[PDB]
Structures are given as structure tokens and as C-alpha cells.
Design a protein around this ligand. Structure first.
Ligand SMILES: [Cl-]
Ligand SMILES: [Cl-]
Ligand SMILES: [Cl-]
Ligand SMILES: [Cl-]
Ligand SMILES: [Cl-]
Ligand SMILES: [Cl-]
Ligand SMILES: [Cs+]
Ligand SMILES: [Cs+]
Ligand SMILES: [Cs+]
Ligand SMILES: [Cs+]
Ligand SMILES: [Cs+]
Ligand SMILES: [Cs+]
Ligand SMILES: [Cs+]
Ligand SMILES: [Cs+]
Length: 115
């Protein structure tokens, strides 16, 4: 009858969003995926509630870029043919890009299924 929560630390990963460099992480409550542009002392420019995330995709290993793509629920007044909102983050750590992507992906998938 035991219940366990995830206990891996929250990563802060070097990532590019809409061609600007920044940091992808989660809020301390693990409810929001947040991206903040460098220097990273301002507020996030992307804040995605894990409750609104509907898919998580990745470039396959050996691709030119390491990218995670998060899809969000359609916005309330979107037209029915419109694509859903999406957010692509390219991992730019020179050696650890794919490792960091995997770590975020794993943490996110665990949280998404836990909720
Ligand atoms: Cl959003
Ligand atoms: Cl949900
Ligand atoms: Cl790769
Ligand atoms: Cl609608
Ligand atoms: Cl996995
Ligand atoms: Cl769930
Ligand atoms: Cs890191
Ligand atoms: Cs969700
Ligand atoms: Cs889903
Ligand atoms: Cs790569
Ligand atoms: Cs809609
Ligand atoms: Cs976007
Ligand atoms: Cs970098
Ligand atoms: Cs659950």
C-alpha cells in the first residue's frame, strides 16, 4: 500500500528557444515547465502547466539537433482545424545535450503519468 513520488533532482538545462539561448527547468512544485532566456535573472518567457501538456516528442539520436517538442492543449478560442500550441527546445550543452534532454524527458513523462 506504499506510495512513492519521484526523487530525482530538477535539472536546469542549456537550451535554445525561438533562436535565443536560455535555461529550461521546472518550478519547485514541479507543476510548470519554464524557459528563461540568458542571463536567466528575469522571469520565464515560457510557462507551461504540466496539466496542459498533451504530448512530448524528441529528435531521434543522431539527428543534427537535440530537440524536445512539447504540445499543449488547444487554446479556448482556437479554430478546430488549427494546430495545437507547441514548444521546441534545442539542447545546446556541447557534450551533454542528449543526456540532458533524456533527463528532462524522463522527469516530465513521470510527472505527466503521476498526475
Ligand atoms: Cl502556455
Ligand atoms: Cl491533464
Ligand atoms: Cl543525439
Ligand atoms: Cl473552441
Ligand atoms: Cl524512459
Ligand atoms: Cl495522469
Ligand atoms: Cs545541467
Ligand atoms: Cs497532462
Ligand atoms: Cs496524451
Ligand atoms: Cs546531435
Ligand atoms: Cs478549441
Ligand atoms: Cs511556440
Ligand atoms: Cs550552450
Ligand atoms: Cs496517477
Amino acid at each position: 500500500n506504499l506510495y512513492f513520488q519521484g526523487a530525482m533532482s530538477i535539472p536546469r538545462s542549456q537550451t535554445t528557444y525561438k533562436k535565443k539561448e536560455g535555461i529550461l527547468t521546472l518550478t519547485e512544485d514541479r507543476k510548470f515547465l519554464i524557459w528563461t532566456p540568458l542571463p536567466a535573472t528575469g522571469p520565464p518567457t515560457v510557462s507551461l502547466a504540466l496539466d496542459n501538456i498533451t504530448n512530448l516528442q524528441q529528435t531521434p539520436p543522431g539527428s543534427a539537433k537535440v530537440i524536445l517538442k512539447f504540445t499543449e492543449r488547444p487554446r479556448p478560442n482556437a479554430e478546430p482545424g488549427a494546430p495545437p500550441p507547441q514548444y521546441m527546445f534545442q539542447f545546446t550543452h556541447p557534450t551533454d545535450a542528449r543526456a540532458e534532454a533524456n533527463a528532462i524527458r524522463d522527469l516530465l513523462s513521470q510527472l505527466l503519468a503521476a498526475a
